[PDB]
C-alpha cells in the first residue's frame, strides 16, 4: 500500500541524521526535504572520489593536449548572472539545489574537480547559500541563470550576495573566507558542469513531492474523520465495491478508510440516527464522502508516480556533454532538459486541485444544516445565533482557496516558447511549473487547516448533541410522571424528545414555534384523541407550562459544563487531542475570545512545520 | 488620444499633494497610486459631513426605535467571525492603505450609515501611516472583501490580535497603535460592522495600482516600438496614417500616430535606408510582424487598458456596501453593490492584454538577438571582438523566454472559477481580488521584460553607432591603401564597395582572416578586376593584401577603444539612452566591462518600479499633440 | 441604452432585404448574420466602381511599364501553396459566405487593386449560393486567413481540386460551379492573389455572427432575470435605481433599469410580498446572489459584448489586405492590416463574458431546483403528486452542470498561445479565427443553457399558478368543514392560518398524511385551541373535522389540479414567453402524465432560440420600454 510508503517517507524525513552522497545510494524526497528543513541534517560526501578524479583528469588533459571537443569559464558565468531581484528563490530551495548539483557529479560523468564537490559539501554544512532571483530559468540547457548564482559564489563574484544562517548576508568572497575556502579558478568544462543542470527545478519538485505525499495521506485520513462527524455510512469503503473497480489508489484508500471506521463509536451514533425516522432520511451519503475512494484513486496514483519520476531526476547526471572517459569520448545530448519533472509538476498540480475540491465539497456539506444530518448552520454553537456566525468566515475563505487553486492548476508545459536564438525550440519550464505546484500546495495546507479545525468543532457539537438529547429525554420523562400522564402519552412524548434534532431548538427550547414544542403539541393532541378528559387536559397544560421551569436551565447547565465521550474511542482521537490539548483550543462560540484566525493559524503552523505528522502516525498505528 | 490621457495620469501622479475626499471630487487611479507610493501625499476629508451624519442618525434612530430593518455586539460578532485569515505572506502596506482610502471614500456619499468619527479616524490612520497586517487570501469579493476588510475594522475597535504597522519599522497590537496616534477603540453601532467589511475596497485598491501601472507601461511599450524600429533597421512606413485610416481601430490609429511622429526624420531611419540600398535583392523588403504589425497588435491592448481604467475608477467612486441607506425616503435598500464583478472581469481582460504586451516584447527581443533577423547586428548583441569569451545578452534572452512563458500562463481567467459559496448564498461571486493579484503578478513580469528590452536596445544603439564608425575606418583604410599601392580606378571603386557592403560584425573578430567575409569580398573583386584588365597588377594586389593585414585591425581596434572609453543625439529616444547610460551609470556591454547583466538590468528595472522612467518618457514625448 | 441598440440589431436582422456594399455604408453584424441565415437577403454592389478601377489600372500600369514594387509586381503559385488544408469538419457554408461578403466589402475602399469584375463575380456567387468547401483549420490570422481564403480564390480561378457547394446538397468541382452560374474562371493579374488571400475576412465573419448572437442572448438572459425573480419569489428592490446610481457602471444602471420596468406591475411580485408577510421571521430577508446581484454581475458582460461589437464592425468595414494601394500618390504602402488582433483579443474577452452569462444561468437554475432555496416550489420542479415516480427536471439540472463546466473550460484564452510562425516572420499572430471558433462553441452551450432555463421557468409559472389555486382549495375546504362541525372562532382562525401558511407542495403527495406538514400544523393548532378554550364536545367536533377532512380534502385538490392539467401570467410582462412556449411551441406542465420527454420540450425552445423565433416574444415582452 502507498499508505506504508508515505509513512516510510515521513519516518525517514524525521529520522535521518546524515545524507549519504556517494553516487550509489539513492537520495529520496524525504532526504532533500530533511536537508532543507532540519539544519542538524548534514551532508556526507564519501571518498566515488576515484571516478570523479578520473573524469576530471580526462577533461583536464584534453585541454593541456589542446584537443578540441565542444563543451572562458567566467564568461559563461558572467553572461548568466542575468536575474533581477524584484522576490527570490528561498534558502531551502537554493540549499536543496546545491545538494542535487553535488549529487549529480558523483556519477563521474561531469568532469568537475573533486575539490569543488568538497566545497559544495562544506557550504551546505555551513549554511552558506547565494541569494538567487526567482525567475529566468526555462529549465532546458538547465536552470542556467539560478545555478549561475551557486557557481558565482564558488568563484567569489563580489556582486553575488550570500546568506550565512538566518541573519548574516555578505558578499560572496567574504562568505568563502568565513568558511576557510578561497575563490575557485574554474577549469575546462567546469562552468558548464555547474550551470547546465536540472537542480533548481528538481529541488523545488522534491519538497513539493514530499509535501504532496504527506498532505495526500492527511486528506485521505481526514475523509474518515469526515464520515464520523457527518453521520456517514462507512459501507462506501467496503472492499468488494473496490475489488470490482480495481484502480490501485481506489482499493488502497478504501482499505485505509474501512480500517479507520471499523469499530467507530461515531459510526454507532450514525446507525442509531438513521434508525430513527428511517424512511424520512437519505439512504446514501452525498458524493464528497461516498465517492471519496473513487476520487482519491487518480490523485494517489499521480502523486506516487510523480515521486518516482522526481527521485530518478534527483539521482541523475544532468549536465552536458556527458564524459565517457572509459571510452575516450564526450557525449552530446541534453540531460539538462527538465521535461520529466516539468510534465509531472503540471499533473500533480491538477491532482492537488482535485484534493482541494474534495475538501471544499466536504466543508460545504458540514456548514449547511440541510446536508449535515443534525449539525447547526456554520457549526455555530450559539445558543444565540444572532451573535454567533460560527465558521462562516472560514466557509467563505474555503471558496476563495478552492477558486484560486483551480486557476493555478492550468498547465505550464503548454507555454513553450522557441528560445535562445531558437536553439531551445523545446524547453521544459520545469522550475516555473514546480513553483506553481508549490503555490498550489500552500493553498491546500490552508484548506486542510480549515477542514481539520471545522471537524474538531463538529466533534464537540456531536458530543454536546448526545448529552443534550439525554437531558431533554430525562426532563420530558420525569415531568410526564409528575404530571400523572398515561404511559401512552409518556412514550409518544419521549419519542419526540429522541427524534427532533436538538440544534433546531437549542436557541429557545420552550419556543412554541420551534421543533421541540411543535412535536410535543402534535403528540398531546393525538393523546387526547386516543384516550377520549377534562383532567387529561389539565395535566397536559401543566406539562407544557412546566417545560419552561426546568428544560432550558438543564440544557444550559450541561452545555456550560461541556464548555468549561465518543472521541476517546475513535481512531481520530490523536487529531482531536492534538488540536484541543496540545494546540490549546476549545469549542468555538461567542463566549470564547479567540478568533477563527487564531485557532486555524495554530493548526496551519503544525501542518507547515511537520508537527501534524505526530498525530497522523499515532492515528495509523497498527494499520497493515 | 490615449497618449495624452496617460501623460495626464503620470502628471497627476507626480503633482498631487493632497487627495480630496468629499463625495463629489473623483479619485482617479493616479491618486490611489500616489497615496500608496508617496507618503508625503495626504488625505483631505472635507466637511459631505452633513450627509454622512444625517445617514448615521437615521440608522441609529431606527435601531434605537427598536424598528426591524434587516442589515441594520451584533456588530462585533460579525468582525470576530471574519477575522478568519491565516499568515502563511500578506497583502502589502500599499494595498492595505489603498483599501483604507477606498473604504473611506465609499462612505462619503452618505449611503452607508457609518459615523463621521470613524471616518476621521480612517483619515488620521492614513496620514499617520498606520495600517493593519492583512492575510493575503480568503476573499471571493462578493459580499465584499469581508475577511481582509475585517482587519481594518479590527484595528478600529482595538482587537488585540490584529497587528498594525506604524511606518516600515514599528509593529504593535491594534490597541497600542490607536493609542500612539491619539485614538480610542470604537464601540460599533447599528450597521457599522457591515459598512466596514462589506465593500469592494481591497480588490479595487489592487486594481487601481494595477491600472495605473498598466497605463504607464502600455505607453512605455508603444513608445519603445519606435526605439526598436531605429536599432533593428526597420521601415517606418508601417506607421503611415493611410494604412490605419482604412482600418480605424482607435488604438491602431493612435499608436501609429505616435510612432510616425517618433520616427519622422530619424537619423537611424537614415542609416536604415542606406542599408537597404546596398544588395537590395538579398535583403527583406518588409519588416517582420513584431515591428510591422505593432500598431495592429497594440490596438486591442490600448483599448482594453483604457476601458478598464474607466471601470476601475467608477468602482473607486462608488458606495459599495449593503443595505444602501436612502435616508431621504426612509428605506434600507437591499442589493449587492459589494459584488466586485466589474473589477473582476476587467482584471481578467487586462491580464490577457498584458500577456499580449509581453508577447510583443518577446518577439522584438528575439529578432534583435539573432544575426539572421537583426540586419547587421551581432548575435546576442555581443561586441566581442572575441566572441569565444563574450556571449553578450544570451542570459537576458533565455530569461525573456522564461518571463513570457509564465506571463502567458498567468493570463488564464480567474472569473471562470466561480464556486457556489457561503452556504450557497453567494452562488455567484466575482473573485475580483484574486484576479487583481494575478494581473499584478503579470505586470511584475512585464516590468522585467521592459527593463531587459530597454537595456538591449541601448546595447544596440551603441553597436549601431560603433558600426557606423567602424565601416568608415574600413573605407578610409581601403581607400588610402589603394592609392599607396597604385591600384587602378576600377579596382579602387570595386574594393570600396565591398568595404561598404559587408556587414562589419561578420568579420570584427578577425578582420584580416582570409576565411571571413571582408577578405572573401575583396578576393572576389580582386579576381574580377584582374579579368576586366598585369603581373604588376597582381604585384600591387598582393601588396594591398599584405599592407591591409598590417594596418586594418589596429585602426579598427583604436576606434573601438575610443568609443568604449553620434546618431542618438538627433533621435527622439536620446532621453532613454542618456538615462540608462548617464543617470544610471552604465556602458556598452562587453568582456571588458565587469558589471554583470543583472547589475545593469536591475538599475533599469528599479527605475521602472519606482517611477523614474517616466521622466525620460515625458521628455521623449514633449511636443507630441 | 444598450437595450435599444440590441433591439435595433434584431429589427435590422429581421427587416433587411439587401446589403448595400458601396464602401461608405457600414455593414453591421446584423447584416452579416442576415446574409448568412436568410438566403432571400441579396448583396447589392452599388457602382465605388470608379475608385476600384482607378486602383486596378494603377496596379496594371506598373505591371505594363515594368516598375518594380514589392507585393504588386505568380498568383497561381501563391494560391497553390496556400491550398494546404485537410478535411478531417469544415468551416460551414454560413461562415464561408459571410467571409465572401467581408472580402468583397474590403475591396470597396479602392485600396486593394483587385478588378471590379472579380468583385461582381463575388456578388454573383453570393447571390447564387455558391461557396467553396473550406477546411476548418490552418489559419493563424496574421498575414490574413491565408489558407481558408485561398479556397475562395481557388473557386474564382476554377481550380478543379477545389470543391464548391451550391445550396445544401450539390457539390461540384469549381469549373462546373462557375459554369452553373454563368461565370468563367479568372486569370489573376498582379496583386490579385494577395488581395484575395491576405485579409481578415474569415475570423471577422465567424466573429460577426458570434457578436450578433452574443448581443441577442445577452438581452435574453437579462430579460429572463426578471422572469426568474417572478417564479422564485424574489424582492424586486434589488433593481432599485438608487442602488445603481451610487455604483454607476453603465451596464449595471441599464440592466437594473430594464428589470425595475419588467417587475413594476408584476402579479407575481404581489404573491411574493404576500408570501414574505406570512412567517416573516422564519423566511430569508434577502434573495441569494444569482438574483440580487444580477445587475452588478451583468454590468461587465453588457459592456464587453457592446465594445466587442464596435471592434468587430470596425473590422468588417476595413481594407485589410497588404500592400495598401495609395494610387492617388503613386505609392504602395507596406503595413500589416491583415493582422487580426483586434478581433482575436476581443473574442477571448467575449468568451469569458459568455462563461459569466452561463454561470449566472447555472446558479439561477440551481436555486430553482432545490426546495430549500425556491420558496415553496417542489424539488426539481416535480409536479407529482407521486414524487417516487416523478423526478421532474433532474436530468436538465445535471445537464446544466455539464453545460456550465465545459463552458468555463472553453473560456480560457487562445491569444496567449502565439507561436513564432512562418520562418519566424509571423513572430506575432492574432489566432483570431481559432478564438472566434471557440467563442462560437461557447455560445452553442449558452443556447443550451437558455433553452433549459426558459423551459424550467415556464414549468415554475405553472407550479406557481397551481400553488395559488391549491391553497385556495385547502382554505375553502378547511373554512367550510370548520362550519359543518360547529368549531369555535378561535379554532376556525387557527386552522385557516395553517391552511394559508403551510407550503402546499410539502404535502401535495398525500394531503391527509398525519406526518406531513398540513396535518402536523392542524394537530398543533388543535392542541392550542383545546388549551385556550379550556371540552369533551370540542374534541368530538375536532375529530369529526379530521375524519371529514380525509374524506373530502384530497379529492378537491386532485380535481383543481386535474382541471389545471387539461391567471397571474396574464398580467405579467413575461406572458409572451410563456404563451410562446406553451401555445406556440405546443408544450404543457411537465409530469408523469405528460408523454413528451424533457428532450422534446427543450429541443423546441432551443430550436426557436437557434433560428431567431425567440426574438418575437422577446420584442413583445419589451414593447413600451424606452
XYZ file of C-alpha atoms in Angstrom, chain B residues 194-443:
250
model
C -21.357 45.702 7.927
C -20.420 49.111 6.449
C -16.769 48.490 7.296
C -16.430 44.887 5.940
C -18.935 44.622 3.119
C -17.166 46.545 0.385
C -15.089 46.026 -2.771
C -12.232 48.162 -1.424
C -9.355 45.657 -1.412
C -9.786 44.299 -4.959
C -10.436 47.826 -6.263
C -7.313 49.023 -4.440
C -5.056 46.408 -6.048
C -6.871 47.049 -9.342
C -6.159 50.812 -9.078
C -2.370 50.441 -8.773
C -2.671 47.676 -11.408
C -4.453 50.029 -13.802
C -2.036 52.913 -13.130
C 0.943 50.646 -13.931
C -0.875 49.175 -16.993
C -1.314 52.684 -18.417
C 2.284 53.761 -17.887
C 3.784 50.513 -19.138
C 1.466 50.413 -22.142
C 2.709 53.889 -23.209
C 6.239 52.769 -22.461
C 5.863 49.652 -24.703
C 4.257 51.621 -27.573
C 6.994 54.263 -27.479
C 9.750 51.652 -27.299
C 8.464 50.153 -30.573
C 9.854 53.337 -32.125
C 13.197 52.650 -30.433
C 13.057 49.047 -31.745
C 12.441 50.352 -35.290
C 15.578 52.551 -35.073
C 18.009 49.862 -33.846
C 16.591 46.946 -35.912
C 16.769 48.939 -39.192
C 13.025 48.954 -39.739
C 10.973 50.698 -42.419
C 8.910 53.465 -40.720
C 6.260 53.181 -43.500
C 4.375 50.610 -41.294
C 3.173 53.673 -39.312
C 1.839 55.626 -42.373
C -1.521 57.126 -41.320
C -3.241 55.997 -44.564
C -2.801 52.277 -43.688
C -4.634 52.830 -40.397
C -7.136 55.290 -41.772
C -8.676 52.358 -43.696
C -8.554 50.003 -40.632
C -9.613 52.546 -37.998
C -9.416 50.880 -34.569
C -8.797 53.897 -32.357
C -5.857 52.153 -30.666
C -4.459 51.302 -34.119
C -4.722 54.923 -35.349
C -3.336 56.389 -32.133
C -0.340 54.014 -31.750
C 0.542 54.523 -35.437
C 0.270 58.312 -34.957
C 2.662 58.261 -32.002
C 5.106 56.055 -33.947
C 5.116 58.097 -37.201
C 5.941 61.140 -35.040
C 8.745 59.472 -33.094
C 10.327 58.157 -36.290
C 9.826 61.203 -38.592
C 13.286 62.395 -39.760
C 15.064 59.825 -37.548
C 18.843 59.758 -38.082
C 18.620 55.993 -37.558
C 15.950 55.700 -40.241
C 18.529 57.356 -42.490
C 21.043 54.543 -41.785
C 18.245 52.029 -42.349
C 17.572 53.492 -45.828
C 21.273 53.434 -46.669
C 21.458 49.773 -45.543
C 18.571 48.559 -47.753
C 20.104 50.361 -50.757
C 23.163 48.029 -50.673
C 22.458 44.461 -52.038
C 18.707 45.215 -52.154
C 17.614 41.867 -53.682
C 19.368 39.952 -50.883
C 17.571 41.818 -48.049
C 13.854 41.725 -46.922
C 11.567 44.399 -48.424
C 9.288 44.452 -45.317
C 9.977 44.159 -41.583
C 8.815 41.175 -39.540
C 5.472 41.246 -37.715
C 6.666 42.277 -34.227
C 7.514 45.689 -35.721
C 5.423 45.878 -38.877
C 2.124 44.813 -37.237
C 2.834 46.598 -33.937
C 0.003 49.160 -34.331
C -2.499 46.425 -35.260
C -1.272 44.403 -32.265
C -1.346 47.332 -29.859
C -4.892 48.397 -30.785
C -6.922 45.983 -28.567
C -4.350 46.290 -25.788
C -4.677 50.087 -25.732
C -8.480 49.892 -25.754
C -8.617 47.183 -23.070
C -6.380 49.101 -20.680
C -8.197 52.421 -21.307
C -11.714 50.934 -20.882
C -10.604 49.019 -17.784
C -9.295 52.226 -16.156
C -12.745 53.829 -16.553
C -14.436 50.771 -14.984
C -11.989 50.640 -12.058
C -12.361 54.414 -11.360
C -16.161 54.015 -11.369
C -15.685 51.453 -8.582
C -13.276 53.744 -6.679
C -16.050 56.333 -6.709
C -18.942 54.135 -5.518
C -20.992 53.284 -2.456
C -20.242 49.567 -2.368
C -21.731 48.197 0.873
C -25.272 46.971 1.660
C -28.072 47.908 2.505
C -27.873 51.258 0.693
C -29.496 53.763 3.127
C -31.928 56.067 1.292
C -32.400 58.207 4.444
C -34.373 60.766 2.434
C -37.187 58.257 1.613
C -36.953 56.137 4.753
C -35.825 52.793 3.338
C -32.858 50.450 3.623
C -32.375 49.233 0.049
C -31.307 45.591 -0.322
C -28.977 44.991 -3.256
C -25.430 43.743 -3.840
C -23.065 46.649 -4.541
C -20.377 44.669 -2.710
C -20.295 42.250 -5.717
C -16.921 43.065 -7.279
C -17.733 41.724 -10.794
C -16.959 44.855 -12.843
C -13.398 44.851 -11.469
C -13.110 41.012 -11.636
C -13.972 40.602 -15.303
C -11.793 43.535 -16.343
C -8.774 42.242 -14.383
C -9.044 39.031 -16.455
C -9.150 41.041 -19.671
C -6.265 43.271 -18.626
C -4.164 40.230 -17.730
C -4.705 38.917 -21.319
C -3.742 42.362 -22.709
C -0.626 42.427 -20.509
C 0.276 38.961 -21.834
C -0.108 40.427 -25.328
C 2.336 43.259 -24.486
C 4.761 40.640 -23.168
C 4.494 38.590 -26.407
C 5.185 41.733 -28.462
C 8.305 42.458 -26.361
C 9.449 38.819 -26.527
C 9.204 38.713 -30.338
C 11.047 42.015 -30.735
C 13.843 40.914 -28.308
C 14.162 37.582 -30.183
C 14.715 39.345 -33.563
C 17.354 41.610 -32.025
C 19.399 38.668 -30.654
C 19.614 36.757 -33.918
C 22.031 37.794 -36.628
C 19.725 36.424 -39.361
C 16.963 38.783 -38.155
C 18.858 41.835 -36.877
C 20.103 43.367 -40.166
C 23.807 43.591 -39.312
C 23.796 43.269 -35.520
C 25.987 40.535 -33.965
C 24.234 37.503 -32.441
C 23.297 38.127 -28.786
C 24.379 41.740 -29.267
C 27.932 40.595 -28.395
C 30.552 43.273 -29.030
C 33.495 40.893 -28.761
C 35.548 41.293 -30.937
C 36.497 37.975 -29.351
C 33.194 36.084 -29.240
C 34.722 32.992 -27.597
C 34.650 34.893 -24.280
C 31.650 37.193 -24.911
C 28.134 35.720 -25.018
C 26.536 39.150 -24.826
C 22.881 39.184 -23.817
C 22.319 35.412 -24.150
C 21.353 35.181 -20.469
C 18.816 38.008 -20.853
C 17.449 36.230 -23.946
C 16.795 32.981 -22.106
C 15.163 34.934 -19.290
C 12.808 36.713 -21.769
C 11.512 33.241 -22.795
C 11.098 32.377 -19.143
C 9.254 35.665 -18.450
C 6.872 35.357 -21.430
C 6.055 31.681 -20.710
C 4.957 32.384 -17.160
C 3.199 35.585 -18.268
C 1.078 33.618 -20.802
C 0.186 31.026 -18.121
C -0.892 33.784 -15.682
C -3.312 35.146 -18.300
C -5.869 32.330 -17.928
C -9.079 33.687 -16.330
C -9.915 33.643 -12.651
C -13.621 34.583 -13.167
C -14.324 31.217 -14.829
C -13.681 29.506 -11.436
C -16.785 30.713 -9.533
C -17.702 28.264 -6.710
C -21.094 28.184 -5.040
C -20.018 29.835 -1.759
C -21.228 30.742 1.787
C -23.993 28.176 2.303
C -24.890 28.655 -1.417
C -25.968 32.223 -0.667
C -23.079 33.560 -2.728
C -23.806 31.317 -5.712
C -22.182 33.925 -7.954
C -19.064 35.740 -6.701
C -16.597 37.939 -8.550
C -13.190 36.717 -7.337
C -12.021 40.293 -8.129
C -9.246 40.421 -5.511
C -7.747 37.112 -6.724
C -7.926 38.309 -10.325
C -6.357 41.680 -9.393
C -3.463 39.878 -7.659
C -2.772 37.728 -10.767
C -2.832 40.789 -13.086
C -0.500 42.495 -10.609
C 1.821 39.487 -10.820
C 1.595 39.635 -14.653
C 2.695 43.328 -14.551
